[PDB]
Amino acid sequence: AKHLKFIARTVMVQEGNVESAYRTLNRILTMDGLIEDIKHRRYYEKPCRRRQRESYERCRRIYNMEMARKINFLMRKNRADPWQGC
Amino acid sequence: RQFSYLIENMARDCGEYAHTRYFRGGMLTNARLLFGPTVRLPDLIIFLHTLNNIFEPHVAVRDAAKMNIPTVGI
Amino acid sequence: ATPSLRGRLARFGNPRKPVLKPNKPLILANRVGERRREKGEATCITEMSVMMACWKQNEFRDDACRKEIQGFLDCAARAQEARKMRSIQETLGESGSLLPNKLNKLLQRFPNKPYLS
Amino acid sequence: PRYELALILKAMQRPETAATLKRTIEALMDRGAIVRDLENLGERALPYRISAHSQQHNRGGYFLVDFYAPTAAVESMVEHLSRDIDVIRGNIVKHPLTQELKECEGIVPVPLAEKLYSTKKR
Amino acid sequence: REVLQLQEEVKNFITRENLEARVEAALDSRKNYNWAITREGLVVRPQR
Amino acid sequence: YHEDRIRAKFYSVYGSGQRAFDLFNPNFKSTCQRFVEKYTELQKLGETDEEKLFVETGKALLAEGVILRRVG
Amino acid sequence: SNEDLPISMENPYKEPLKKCILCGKHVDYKNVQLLSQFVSPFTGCIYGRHITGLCGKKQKEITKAIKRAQIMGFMPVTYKDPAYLKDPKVCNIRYRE
Amino acid sequence: KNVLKIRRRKMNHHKYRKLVKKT
Amino acid sequence: DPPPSTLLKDYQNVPGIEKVDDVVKRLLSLEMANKKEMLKIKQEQFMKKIVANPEDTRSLEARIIALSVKIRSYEEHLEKHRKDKAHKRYLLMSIDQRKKMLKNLRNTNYDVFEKICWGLGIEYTFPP
Amino acid sequence: TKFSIYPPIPGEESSLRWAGKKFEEIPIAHIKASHNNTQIQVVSASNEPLAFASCGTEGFRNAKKGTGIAAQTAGIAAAARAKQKGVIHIRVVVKGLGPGRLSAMHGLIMGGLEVISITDNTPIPHXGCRPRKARKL
RNA sequence: AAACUCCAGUUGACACAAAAUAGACUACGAAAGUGGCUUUAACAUAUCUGAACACACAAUAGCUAAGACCCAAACUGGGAUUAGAUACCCCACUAUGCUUAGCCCUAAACCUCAACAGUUAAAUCAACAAAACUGCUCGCCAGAACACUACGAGCCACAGCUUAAAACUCAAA
Ligand code: FES
Ligand SMILES: [K+]
Ligand SMILES: [K+]
Ligand SMILES: [Mg+2]
Ligand SMILES: [Mg+2]
Ligand SMILES: [Mg+2]
Ligand SMILES: [Mg+2]
Ligand SMILES: [Mg+2]
Ligand SMILES: [Mg+2]
Ligand SMILES: [Mg+2]
Ligand SMILES: [Mg+2]
């Protein structure tokens, strides 16, 4: 309200490509967490429920990041079998 | 499996036996059924690798002990 | 960097209250989730209204709206092939690093060992 | 203790700005403060619009006053700045140079936690 | 050593005698606390 | 080993030699090992300073024709 | 006994601990140029330490400095001050494809 | 665990509170 | 309380502190310091007045004096903060821990126990 | 010069122009994308209303207002009334995550207006009023 | 559908309400709790255990008195749904949530895992969960149900809280 306008969350359109500008803006708002924040602010999330959600989301990140680390570690072994027939 | 061919040849050359393939359940503890009532089991099992291809002990290590067969193993 | 798990779970020896309350043990499975689908959304509606917009102005006379109709007709044909091509792309596995069944055979060869042998 | 007064003043001409600083530094001295230095950070556009004393402000003069004062002077000074119509926003903080930064050896890596679950077969 | 360093600084403190002179001297000068850091950990002072 | 201290400094000062390790030859000697052997010889001659015993060693090898390109 | 036996000592090849880009440097709330390097250009959101690469000690100092500077009248809250958009990019985040 | 013991106590307390209100 | 002009415990024994400018004396006095610095001066006064060795801080006497200074600070805090339940607990716990110190000092050194009670103004009471 | 997605800052000297008008002078299309209805108002850079169109003003009612095609129709209507007043280039400021968030922008383009920038102004309280309780379904 | 059209959108002015991001951090406090900014005061114990006979605390809801009031919201009213709908869904609004001063003293107040010291040695180990134990101390427990009940006593509590049985019944829980 008291800040300057047309600086925050503003993406310029290039060559009239409004589809790509909107995707960039939506990608910006998502990466900064605003979309999930706005979605979670439509109905009050009580603190017990918010604490449960944060735990679930934090445990999911740990599992997903560790599973991703193992996939990248083993991907070199996806090469053809060197000892085919034995 | 890098050495399956090498080991299979060494066994034939020395006049002995090699099992470098997937080890089926009961080759030793159920040998009479799989081969016949008069099948003679090995008197000595030599492990050049004691682990299977999932980094666990080869099942034949336990099954050799069950049948009271001495094992040599690297 | 994976978030820390030191002092996060309720355990003997951990004085603080637990940071995390996982309903499942934090142990990597030997499989990954299936290649899920994106729930379909209606297509070509932008072309649909150009056809229907001209219909209203020209009293639903096709002759006047031939160009707007050919647009919607072509858009629907492309979406019917694009959907079918999407299925072929799914089998190819180009989008993903590996197919879930090809990525699970690889995990079958290096299974997580949460126990002692 | 040693404090740092972050002072945003109404954008004014040099004569009225000098009178405000003198009137503000004298208020500090009247409360027992020992003023150490006065630094001008320059006039600039505010990061957002600030309403103060029935006026809207978009520019201000940023000044710092380094001083020592008894602990009882802070509360009394904050009240003084609230009534000065030429002050947009004034904050008194403990001087950052008093807090000495401890030495840092670097980033100690955190190993993946072990023995979180029994080794029984599941 | 801290009392010696502090005893010299007190010479440059503001007093009711030099207050008007120190105010005008401040209005003529500019102090800049801005500087940036790089991916290599190097400070990039402002262009002034 | 005691020489590991000399090896850590040599790799820091001069880096890994552009000459390639040949781990198949059981008697291979790298530039670092050649440096360590000279460093050990000069220590046995009575020199005990560390920073001085390290600079004199580099000179000896340069005299022998060895290439020692300082990393920095 | 024997000269060739291993000897007990500390790892001579151990690498020095890594340091954050702000290790050993003072973080002041008045240095808005520095603080602006750790907020989102579009939303003003403070970047997490996984984006800034800072240690816990400096991630806290930067956070506390930003919050102080914002409400004291030194730093905008809803966007990065455009004056600082051309400063060195020290954070690991890309918003354009 | 199931909540069958909690449920027994739940009904007892409900009926008691209701009895007190009635009398 | 010690006068505000009192120097800090750290700067009282530096050579030449009596010949420095008055401004420098104000900056090294209690007036320009937090209350915790005034409590360090109060602890020092009690030590010289009561304990035989004012430099031994691990004796049961010094602990009773150190804790007695904390107890008085809690009372002054609570005089202005009467709904601060956290510090009310610290006060009540500290009073109980001094009584446990006084009990053990009374059992071990009665002559010193009497000097501690007179010096600090403590009226020892036997529990009910 | 390379393209900058960051808008030109007022008071600085930019070279970008649209029909000889600076960024600060381009009219603004305010799109309110609610969960049920989309509202579009085109105002001048001096905050003078030029055109307004909502899904309800285009004859949609109840759940039909909360559709993408309903917002697209509102965009075309606002674009038509705005073009008559001399509007070609507009700055779009969309607040809300409703279904007509993107569709309303398409209608503005199909109606003859050129979008030079997109701004999100969805209200996000930083701690604010307590929202209504969660619905059981 | 009802409701509102002194309604909606733009802009400016704009709080005794609540505190995005940081936080992938895991810190503080005895616990309850504590994540906007500044300052002030400030975080017991130089052995450990230890009060249900005491003292001081204790989320939320609630009571009493005086204020504030954006938003939310038991109850209630209307709309819809339904065989019914004293619900779930929609709208409006109050107690209440907030401040001040007193009360009330309860939570799945549970991380259902006591404080202090120590061990990984084995005879590891019902099962599951969050591996198995040693020393020492306090607290507590002894089939289910009756029973977070009755009676007694205490209490600013009066449809309350704490302490807390028995008879009858079952062969299980
Ligand atoms: S790593 Fe040293 S302060 Fe960050
Ligand atoms: K906040
Ligand atoms: K629990
Ligand atoms: Mg223990
Ligand atoms: Mg569970
Ligand atoms: Mg269950
Ligand atoms: Mg019952
Ligand atoms: Mg359901
Ligand atoms: Mg109606
Ligand atoms: Mg105790
Ligand atoms: Mg107790």
Ligand SMILES: [Mg+2]
């Ligand atoms: Mg309570």
Ligand SMILES: [Mg+2]
């Ligand atoms: Mg209340």
Ligand SMILES: [Mg+2]
């Ligand atoms: Mg309301």
Ligand SMILES: [Mg+2]
């Ligand atoms: Mg009703």
Ligand SMILES: [Mg+2]
């Ligand atoms: Mg109300």
Ligand SMILES: [Mg+2]
């Ligand atoms: Mg409040």
Ligand SMILES: [Mg+2]
């Ligand atoms: Mg709790």
Ligand SMILES: [Mg+2]
């Ligand atoms: Mg319990």
Ligand SMILES: [Mg+2]
């Ligand atoms: Mg206990």
Ligand SMILES: [Mg+2]
């Ligand atoms: Mg109860």
Ligand SMILES: [Mg+2]
């Ligand atoms: Mg009762």
Ligand SMILES: [Mg+2]
């Ligand atoms: Mg009774």
